[PDB]
Amino acid sequence: MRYGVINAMAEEKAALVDAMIDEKKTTIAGKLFHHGKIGHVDVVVVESGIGKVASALTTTLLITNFGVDAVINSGSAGALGTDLRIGDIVIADYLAYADADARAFGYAYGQVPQQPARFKADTDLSNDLSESYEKVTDARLVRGLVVTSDSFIASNEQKQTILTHFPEAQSAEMEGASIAQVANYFDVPFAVVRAISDNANGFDDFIVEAGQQSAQVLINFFEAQA
Amino acid sequence: YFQSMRYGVINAMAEEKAALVDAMIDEKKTTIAGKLFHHGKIGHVDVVVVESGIGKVASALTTTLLITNFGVDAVINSGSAGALGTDLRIGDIVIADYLAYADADARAFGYAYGQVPQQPARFKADTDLSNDLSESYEKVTDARLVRGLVVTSDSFIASNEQKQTILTHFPEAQSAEMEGASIAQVANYFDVPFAVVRAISDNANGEAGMTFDDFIVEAGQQSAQVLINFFEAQA
C-alpha cells in the first residue's frame, strides 16, 4: 500500500519526513517528492501548491509518477459552518466548486460541465482518518461538504454568498475539489481534511500545532497497517 | 516523432481536429492516462493534437500530460468563445496577448484582482508564436484580427450581469472562456511558449447572426487551414 499525502502545512511535512525510514527524494517537473516508509506502509509526501490549477498539476504528477493507491490532502481553512470554531476538524464527505456556474445548460450550481456535480471522498479512508483523530486527539470532528475556489474567502459577506448556494458547506478553501477532480479522473480514492483556522464570525502557533497534530494522526494511521 | 519542431494543439472544435488529422502523414493514435493524442507530420513539423477538456482542472491536466509525455516546443490552444469586447462581431479572431482568471480574488493578501497567489497576475502569450499565427490568419483568411486580453473561469458566462461583472474588473477583456488561463498557467510553469486563439461566436451588440452550430463548423475548418499554413511555413 502506497499513500500520497498532498500537504500545505510545513510542520506536517517535517514531522512526516522525520518519521520516515529510508527517505528518497525526487524532484519531478520541479515538484519535490519525499518517499519513505512509515510503519510498514509506503508514503509519498508533496506540497500541493496554491489554487486549483497548481494542486491539479501536483496531483497529476503524484499519481502518474508514483502510482499511489490513495491520496490524503490535509490543510487548514476557515469555517463557513456557523457551529464550527478554530480547532475543529472537518473531514470532507463531498467536495464541490464554490462559484462554478454553468446553470444555463442545466448543470447544478458548482458543477463544471463533464464533471460530476460533487466529488465523493472515499468512505473507508475518511472513516479510518476519523478513527485516528478520535484515538490520538480530543478534537471535535465534523463530516460534511467542503467547497473550493481560486479566491481567498476572507469576509463573512463572501461566506454567506457561498452559503446561499451551499447551505450545508462547512469550509471554503483553494485546493480540495481540484485534487478530488484529478483523483476521481484516475479512479484513486481520496480524503480531504481541514483544520478550522478561524470562526465564521471571526492565531499563535495554530498552523504549527495543527500541522503537528495532523502528522501524529497520519503516523498513527500508517503505523496501524499490516 | 522525428521532426525537430513539435507543436501541441490543445483542441475543442471537431472540424479542426478532423482537418488536422486528415493533413497528417503517418497519423498515430496514442492513449496516455485516458487521453487520446493524435500525432503526426504536417509540412516539416510534428503536431500533437489532444482535446482540452472543459474547465480549468481538466485543461490543466491535459496540458500537464501533453508537456510531460511529448516535450512539445510550444502549445497552441484554439477555440471559439463569445464576445465581451463592445466592437466584436461574429467571425472576429482574438489572438490573446494575455490571459487572466476572471474571478480569482485574493486581494486581501495584496494580490491584483484575478491573481492566484504564487502566480503572475496575468500570463503572457508567446510574442513570436502569436505573431506567426496572426500572419497565417492574414495570409489565408479575411477575418478581422483582434489582439488583447482573454479571461478564464469555471463558469459559463451568459447573462448581461455576468458579463458586466467581468468588465468592471477587466475593462479591456475581449472574451471570457473556460480553459485559456489554466492552459497558460501550466505552460508557463514548464517554460513552454503558448498561444490562445478564439473565434468570436456572437456579436457584442446583440445583433442576430448565424447559429452557433453553423458557425462552429466554419470556425474549425478555418482554424485548421490557418494552422496547416503555419506548420508548412516553419520548414
UniProtKB/TrEMBL annotation, chain B:
Enzyme class of the recorded protein, top EC level = hydrolase
Q: What is its EC number?
A: 3.2.2.9
A Gene Ontology biological process noted in the UniProt record is: L-methionine salvage from methylthioadenosine
Q: Does the keyword Hydrolase apply?
A: yes
Give UniProt keywords alphabetically: Amino-acid biosynthesis, Glycosidase, Hydrolase, Methionine biosynthesis
Q: Which pathway does the UniProt entry assign to this protein? A: Amino-acid biosynthesis; L-methionine biosynthesis via salvage pathway; S-methyl-5-thio-alpha-D-ribose 1-phosphate from S-methyl-5'-thioadenosine (hydrolase route): step 1/2
Q: Which GO terms describe its cellular component?
A: cytosol
CDD domains listed in its UniProt record? MTAN (cd09008)
Record's keyword annotation contains S-adenosyl-L-methionine: no
Gene3D superfamilies linked: Nucleoside phosphorylase domain (3.40.50.1580)
Q: Which residues form the Nucleoside phosphorylase domain?
A: 6-231
One GO molecular function term of this record is: methylthioadenosine nucleosidase activity
**Matches recorded under InterPro entries:** MTA_SAH_Nsdase (IPR010049), Nucleoside_phosphorylase_d (IPR000845), Nucleoside_phosphorylase_sf (IPR035994)
PANTHER family, sorted: 5'-METHYLTHIOADENOSINE/S-ADENOSYLHOMOCYSTEINE NUCLEOSIDASE, 5'-METHYLTHIOADENOSINE_S-ADENOSYLHOMOCYSTEINE NUCLEOSIDASE
Record-given protein name? adenosylhomocysteine nucleosidase
Q: Which organism is it from?
A: Weissella paramesenteroides ATCC 33313
The protein's gene is named mtnN
